[PDB]
Design an enzyme around this catalytic site. Structure first.
Site, PDB file in Angstrom:
ATOM      1  N   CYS C 152       0.983  -1.328   0.153  1.00 30.13           N
ATOM      2  CA  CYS C 152      -0.094   0.008   0.017  1.00 30.13           C
ATOM      3  C   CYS C 152       0.823   1.202   0.057  1.00 30.13           C
ATOM      4  O   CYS C 152       0.351   2.304  -0.383  1.00 30.13           O
ATOM      5  CB  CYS C 152      -0.904   0.050   1.098  1.00 30.13           C
ATOM      6  SG  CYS C 152      -0.350  -0.386   2.700  1.00 30.13           S
ATOM      7  N   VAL C 156       0.319   4.346  -2.426  1.00 30.47           N
ATOM      8  CA  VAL C 156      -0.452   5.622  -1.923  1.00 30.47           C
ATOM      9  C   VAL C 156       0.755   6.674  -2.393  1.00 30.47           C
ATOM     10  O   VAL C 156       0.137   7.765  -2.866  1.00 30.47           O
ATOM     11  CB  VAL C 156      -0.273   5.772  -0.251  1.00 30.47           C
ATOM     12  CG1 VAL C 156      -0.037   7.107   0.148  1.00 30.47           C
ATOM     13  CG2 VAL C 156      -1.135   4.945   0.194  1.00 30.47           C
TER      14      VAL C 156
END
Ligand code: ICS
Ligand code: CLF
Ligand code: CLF
Ligand SMILES: [Ca+2]
Ligand SMILES: [Ca+2]
Lengths: 477, 522, 522, 477
Positions: C152, C156
């Site tokens: 992630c 991001v």
């Protein structure tokens, strides 16, 4: 099917037999005429089975050890002879009891003398005496011993009666010799009779001169309920709600003492006529105790029976009778409301032992179902006498049906449900026909009484209407 | 009473207060029951070393046996032949029992006939029963072979099977050419497995004794496999599967796999699959004959060696790692086919599972029982797993077999605390799991009653049952399992380690009491 | 203290009185613990309908999820290709967790790399990590392919996977021809199954997108099989076995069966088996593509239909009787191969087992959870068994899926009392099995804590767990099982009915109390 | 294996790497010199992992949530971010505790904010506040909340500190913001330091002006024992038998109140130096509490440790110390007598986290075994400083070892046993080498203390000497 169609079916099926078997078997198959009171006109029963035709019958040891003596919970029953019979019959029958097994109760255990060849050649009486000592040592709370003879005992000339008398005197113990060797009679039935006489000769008279038992006008015994899945308990509860006192249960959950107290009762209530009519008659002749037949399968029969039993007593029991019936009315009405519409019109074939093939027809009809064929392994003609009035016109009757016959009958008649035994079950399931075990209750039950009726209904429904029966044919053929 | 929307069966119906009160009154009024304190005292006593001594001094009484009688095994043997009807010459009660016993284990039809000898036949013998019986059976159920055994009645009265069948043919009750192999199968000699041995030897002799002269060992390039008394479908299947993956020609002699597992597709099939008459007739032409369960196939062996001239290899049952290895290597030697990559990999996957699960298996103590070959294979595999087979019970075992098992035990440190019992029953075993408590039992459904007894002493004394063997009546479809080969060992390992972990989860499920050890990961 | 001859691990060591006393002093002296009556009060409250109402009003808090995150699924997909290293671009913590998670379920090595993005990559992006990471991976572990997904952090901060791989090849860190398929797999979208879908579609695209012009549908006479996220070895194997039995040509696309089950033979195999690059390149030439778990293969489907021009059939997961039938019939239609006698027989054997066990299964109530296809298949099979799947929980389910399951339920009377929950977790489910108690749970190992909770209310409230799904951490070798096809249904049926009979034996094991119903035969 | 041989092995293994990785990894591999004081002479540590080389390391979230905060039993710990991290770490570590889970204790549960894309795009602070309200509603007995940051939190600019302060005052509850995002640092280690600082800033001083706690001269805290399989309980028992009062356990089976009471103790006993030296030093600086390192692995180290701890107190504790040592002496002598003969001379390689690769060496040597290779995932050079004196000469040392390295090292050295983690276990079992997990104790333990030593010996023996290891090669080859 018309009467004529059933007769034609019978002759067709009979066509495969050698002529001797064909002529024997013709006499054991019949088309019901509900007007007939005397069955000997239309069917023969309690004869030898034909060799090689796969009778569903067992033997006299099955009738004495398996059926009558085995459930007596605080006695130890010895399967006397080689190791087979006691092993196959160990805990096969769900004759329920309350006790501490191996300590004060022994029903699901298998005691055996395990005959080896030396016992065959030299006799087993010395081994039996030694066995009885070992039984006393290792099971001191047992309250009596029975000796259930297997095939070799009578064939080799053992004297188990002498052993029972002598060891019985030495140990001050009731030890009952039973000559239920598998070669005697033609089925379980003679085992019933031998067993009844053994109770009579060795047990029933022990308290003949004892007057310490406090009796009441409402003392009864339940005769011939072996408490399959709790059947006898769900009967007893009703009898005592009606104000009666059940001194004894023969022999499901039965104790030796209640057996011994049974001659003190005011009335014998006979459920299984076949297996215990002998001792019921004896008790009428010797003690003056009347006996009456009853039926606790389904609300119609249970209500009728309760009323008939209550009429044998005074106003107080009759009043209590109507209170019981009123208490249970909404319960069995609820069961009928739930399940009869799901079972209405469905057709059933039965094949069982000596009582249930007629005795359960009423419960089925209480669910709107129709019994289109029925038969018994080992019933006598007084049973068929009682059967033809309970069955519809044109229905099929079979005595000691062969495997071949039963399969062909089912193939032609096409029942929606079959009720029979473990040896039949998987055969007919594979044919896509819903099956309920009507000996073992397929590990469910009780089926007796009002509480039993709810379970009966649930069971017939769960199986007849199960999704699995829609799935036997592959969608690609 | 019943609540119509949630109907109670016996359990828990009779736990209702009106039923409990009724039962208390039955007891109090009419049962003349020993006081509960006395019942407790006697129970406690039955759990002691003193009782155990009295128990093992028994000479005449047998309680809860772990064996059955010969004709049961004769029937199972016979079911393994194409369109073959097992036929038990004797009293019919026996056949109702044989059929029901197997019905309940396999949840399948089991076809077998009697010729219904009664009191009449008890002094005159059963010759007429045999004549009418063979004719009736052949006419009605249309088998292509009738395999005849006996009940103890026929044995005691001395019926000559051979003479009776010969006379049955001589007088026209069955055709002379119709196959009626036979074996004497007395209740009172050996056990059910002995019956299997006798029936098989009878069938082999029937098809090969009189025609040995055109036979040449190895001439059909196959290996015969004799399974013995076998009640796991998976064991027939796994043996056929391994031989096929090796490219080995084989003939499985007595193969009930199909007939014990027919589909529910709208018809009942009385017969299905099975060893053909062709196969039996041709069997002497095999390279050799391998016996899967040699300790109840001694008579069969005597015949195969002496008449067929096969040099039967000295193999243990192919159970566990070493004995599956040995079976495969011997098969390779006999056939000349190498062990294929697939079986080598399967073996390695079994070893891998052993490495994965050894920390939970290590030092676990077992009481176990069953038939001799099954029992010794279970013992061997337990030693391979680092387990201790402390109480090894084989009711129908013999002294030679016990010597063999003791040698197996001696060859491993994990056998130190193990004892082998022959002639002893499950009442004996009950005492052993009280006085020298193991972690588990491995046995058939009769073991459930021992588990009950132990829990009655207390939860800490409970010995849970692990169901492997025969009969298994109180679980569904375990008869589909495998206990032979690497596959069988994989299933047994999995069952054992997960029984261990189930029990541990039960003992650690107690909130704020024992669940500190209720690990997500084991 | 310890007794050397019987050493105690934590259980039951800390039950010794000296440990007990010590823990009592720690609690009373320093823990400032709520009084036991308050703890009891609150627990009791958490079993109530009021509590459940508060529980189901949660919008922000999640407690005990029944899902994982996308790259977990990417790694499993990637493991299914020949000599392929899963590579997760992002922070290394993730990869330690993915590997451990599968280690514990399969009890096997799980190989996967990270490129270990740290605070520096947080601001400059991870381009350098991709260059060095790809080069290092290729050199050190020698894969033939590297399959790239993301953590992630990488999502991001917006790392462009495609650009980064392209630049790695442009600047010579790895050869231009070296296959590096990729997929963006954000933690915060969907669940682990979505990561599988994304990874698979990425590999498909990598090998076929630019080579479509010489492709001809049906020209290789095979059917492509896409299994989706699958954690039972038996499910890969049973599909392959059934297809082989039909003589159907096939290509199983992503096949980790070998690499998740290597033998312990003295060597570690980092790679084993798997779908070949050629199989993926040649895949558009198949007759069609079948998706075994369509509800998490929607992206893959859109690509297979849109680019390969295969008319992907509308099939449910082949679980239970009807959907295995439908699967086999569609495969027959596409392939032109008839369904063989062996499979028809297997079907009939499943149906025999259903008739054998229907009386113990009927009306049994289950709570269950898992991934959408698994769950709807389990539900279907339970309806076929006459069981009621009363609480159906699928945390990572959606409203389209729920509508399909609601329709399946409506089509059977056994679905009347069933509710489907999507977006709900195992704390929600906990409430449901207290307020509307079922007979059993069917779920993964996290369910053990619900069984614990229910037993704490009382034995009569205990809901036993039946372990089917993922992950299973607290039993050994259940990952070898099968849940698809007739074979899987036979296994599930056996597990269910025997869980039922196990619990009944427990409830009837009470000497002279409940053991009147402790039947030898069931 | 001589020094030059180990060095040659190292150069051999390094030949597979690209040049950058080769030059880096060369600095993280060494041949032990027990004489060396400053390990920076010979090895580098606590640096970035090389991309793509399959490090065994975790992240700062693992070090904070998995290791330090997670075990604190009466607090609820929020895995704040997307669903993965909390799920993979749910109940993976055996930090044992006593409590009523879901009610007053929460350790094996997974609380999470389950970030969806909208939370990434808009931020998660409003979600976090609503989440805290829901936690309060549904878990009223929680005694505080921690917020364990996962990767996206700091990346999207969320302000969990403000939320912790605002909601903390509103609820009058300790709510602890922890910035343990996985992208921070290089491993679990920085997560330790971050977690220590969070305890410092949000919890440890709450009772600074509270003087109600009754203190004694013998108050200690166990610092850095996370009670794996009950390790801290089997340590605590010994400390209290010696006459000490264990006021607090950080953090295995730890409560927030114990933590808050820790500034009242007289001495901090540090087991895991790596993860909690930070807060120990803080407590010396702020409260004047001294701390000391100790080792409860095996009898030699446990005895040395007991004596050294007791020496910090008066003669009465030194006497009790000798009494405890005498009490347990025959027990561990019996352990040695039973298992050492089966383990004498066997060679072990270790690879673990930040403490055990040096701390269990004495325990191995008490069973006559030799540690021939050891290494750490995430230790600093002060750990290596402490390591080189505990290891034999010319033994192999590895920092942040790669998958490849560990495999090649094992192939050349051929140890009889390996002790490492779950990602390593099945690799080396397949190679025929007995493996014990030395994080989870392979679901066994405790291993700390005298009671722990018995289990340790039992486990090393059951595995190293298991029959399975003799069977990996098929007899046909
Ligand atoms: S805290 Fe550390 S990796 Fe000191 S992060 Fe790790 S329960 Fe290891 S070597 Mo797992 S510095 Fe503890 C550890 Fe050691 S989780 Fe446990 S075993 S003694
Ligand atoms: S009619 Fe017994 S099963 Fe038989 S072969 Fe002898 S041991 Fe075996 Fe009835 S009494 Fe019994 S059951 Fe038969 S033998 Fe006779
Ligand atoms: S390094 Fe550590 S474990 Fe990794 S994410 Fe970062 S804090 Fe967490 Fe989390 S959800 Fe899944 S597992 Fe990752 S991709 Fe995000
Ligand atoms: Ca069946
Ligand atoms: Ca493994």
């Amino acid at each position: 099917m018309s009467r004529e169609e059933v007769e034609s079916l019978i002759q067709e099926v009979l066509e495969v037999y050698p002529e001797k078997a064909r002529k024997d078997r013709n006499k054991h198959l019949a088309v019901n005429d509900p007007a007939v009171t005397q069955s000997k006109k239309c069917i023969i029963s309690n004869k030898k089975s034909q060799p090689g035709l796969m009778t569903i019958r067992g033997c006299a040891y099955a009738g004495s050890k398996g059926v009558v003596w085995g459930p007596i919970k605080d006695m130890i029953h010895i399967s006397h002879g080689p190791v087979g019979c006691g092993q196959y019959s160990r805990a096969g029958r769900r004759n329920y009891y309350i006790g501490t097994t191996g300590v004060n109760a022994f029903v699901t255990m298998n005691f055996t003398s395990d005959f080896q060849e030396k016992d065959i050649v030299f006799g087993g009486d010395k081994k039996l005496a030694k066995l009885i000592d070992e039984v006393e040592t290792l099971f001191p709370l047992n309250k009596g011993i029975s000796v259930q003879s297997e095939c070799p005992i009578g064939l080799i000339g053992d004297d188990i009666e002498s052993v029972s008398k002598v060891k019985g005197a030495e140990l001050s113990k009731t030890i009952v010799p039973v000559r239920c060797e598998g070669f005697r009679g033609v089925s379980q039935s003679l085992g019933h009779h031998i067993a009844n006489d053994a109770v009579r000769d060795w047990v029933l008279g022990k308290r003949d001169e004892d007057t310490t038992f406090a009796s009441t006008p409402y003392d009864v015994a339940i005769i011939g309920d072996y408490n399959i899945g709790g059947d006898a308990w769900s009967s007893r509860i009703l009898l005592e709600e009606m104000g009666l006192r059940c001194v004894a249960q023969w022999s499901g959950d039965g104790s030796i003492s209640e057996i011994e107290l049974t001659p003190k009762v005011k009335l014998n209530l006979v459920h299984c006529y076949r297996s215990m009519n002998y001792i019921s008659r004896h008790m009428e002749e010797k003690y003056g105790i009347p006996w009456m037949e009853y039926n606790f399968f389904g609300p119609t029969k249970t209500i009728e029976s309760l009323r008939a039993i209550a009429a044998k007593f005074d106003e107080s029991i009759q009043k209590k009778c109507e209170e019981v019936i009123a208490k249970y009315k909404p319960e069995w009405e609820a069961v009928v409301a739930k399940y009869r519409p799901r079972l209405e019109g469905k057709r059933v074939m039965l094949y069982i032992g000596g009582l249930r093939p007629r005795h359960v027809i009423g419960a089925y009809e209480d669910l709107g179902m129709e019994v289109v064929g029925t038969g018994y392994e080992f019933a006598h003609n007084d049973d068929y006498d009682r059967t033809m009035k309970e069955m519809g016109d044109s229905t099929l009757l079979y005595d000691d049906v062969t495997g071949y016959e039963f399969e062909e009958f089912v193939k032609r008649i096409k029942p929606d449900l079959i009720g029979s035994g473990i040896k039949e079950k998987f055969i007919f399931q594979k044919m896509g026909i819903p099956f309920r075990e009507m000996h073992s209750w397929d590990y469910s039950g009780p089926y007796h009484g009002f509480d039993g009726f709810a379970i009966f209904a649930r069971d017939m429904d769960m199986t007849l209407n199960n999704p699995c029966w829609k799935k036997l044919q592959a969608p690609w053929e | 009473s019943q609540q119509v929307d949630k109907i109670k069966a016996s359990y828990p119906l009779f736990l209702d207060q009106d039923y409990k009160d009724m039962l208390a009154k039955k007891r109090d009024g009419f049962e003349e029951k020993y006081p509960q304190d006395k019942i407790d005292e006697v129970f406690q006593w039955t759990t002691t070393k003193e009782y155990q001594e009295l128990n093992f001094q028994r000479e005449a009484l047998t309680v809860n046996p772990a064996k059955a009688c010969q004709p049961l095994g004769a029937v199972l043997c016979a079911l393994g032949f194409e369109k073959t009807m097992p036929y038990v010459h004797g009293s019919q009660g026996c056949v109702a029992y044989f059929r029901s016993y197997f019905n309940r284990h396999f949840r399948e039809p089991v076809s077998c006939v009697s010729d219904s000898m009664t009191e009449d036949a008890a002094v005159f013998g059963g010759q007429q029963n045999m004549k009418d019986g063979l004719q009736n059976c052949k006419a009605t159920y249309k088998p292509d072979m009738i395999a005849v055994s006996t009940t103890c009645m026929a044995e005691v009265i001395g019926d000559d099977l051979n003479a009776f069948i010969n006379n049955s043919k001589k007088e026209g009750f069955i055709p002379d050419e119709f196959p009626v192999p036979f074996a004497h199968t007395p209740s009172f000699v050996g056990s059910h497995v002995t019956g299997w041995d006798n029936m098989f030897e009878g069938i082999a002799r029937y098809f090969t004794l009189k025609s040995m002269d055109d036979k040449v060992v190895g001439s059909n390039k196959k290996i015969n496999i004799v399974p013995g008394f076998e009640t796991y479908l998976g064991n027939f299947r796994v043996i056929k599967r391994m031989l096929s993956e090796m490219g080995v020609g084989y003939s499985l002699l007595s193969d009930p796999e199909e007939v014990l597992d027919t589909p529910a597709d709208g018809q009942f099939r009385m017969y299905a699959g099975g060893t053909t008459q062709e196969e039996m007739k041709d069997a002497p032409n095999a390279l050799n004959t391998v016996l899967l369960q040699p300790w109840h196939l001694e008579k069969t062996k005597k015949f195969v060696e002496g008449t067929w001239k096969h040099e039967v290899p000295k193999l243990n049952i192919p159970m566990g790692l070493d004995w599956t290895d040995e079976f495969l290597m011997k098969v390779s030697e006999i056939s000349g086919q190498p062990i294929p990559a697939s079986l080598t990999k399967e073996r390695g996957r079994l070893v891998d599972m052993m490495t994965d699960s050894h920390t939970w298996l290590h030092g676990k103590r077992f009481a176990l029982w069953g038939d001799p070959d099954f029992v010794m294979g279970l013992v061997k595999f337990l030693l391979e797993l680092g387990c201790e087979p402390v109480h090894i019970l084989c009711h129908n075992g013999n002294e030679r077999w016990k010597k063999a098992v003791d040698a197996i035990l001696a060859a491993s440190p994990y056998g130190k605390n193990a004892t082998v019992y022959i002639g002893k029953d499950l009442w004996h075993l009950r005492s052993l799991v009280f006085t020298d408590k193991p972690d588990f039992m491995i046995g058939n459904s009769y073991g459930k009653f021992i588990q009950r007894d132990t829990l009655h002493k207390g939860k800490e004394f409970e010995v849970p049952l692990i169901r492997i063997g025969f009969p298994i009546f109180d679980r569904h479809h375990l008869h589909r399992s495998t206990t032979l080969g690497y596959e069988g060992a994989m299933q047994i390992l999995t069952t054992l380690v997960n029984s261990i972990l189930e029990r541990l989860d039960e003992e650690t499920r107690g909130m704020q009491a024992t669940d500190y050890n209720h690990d997500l990961v084991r």
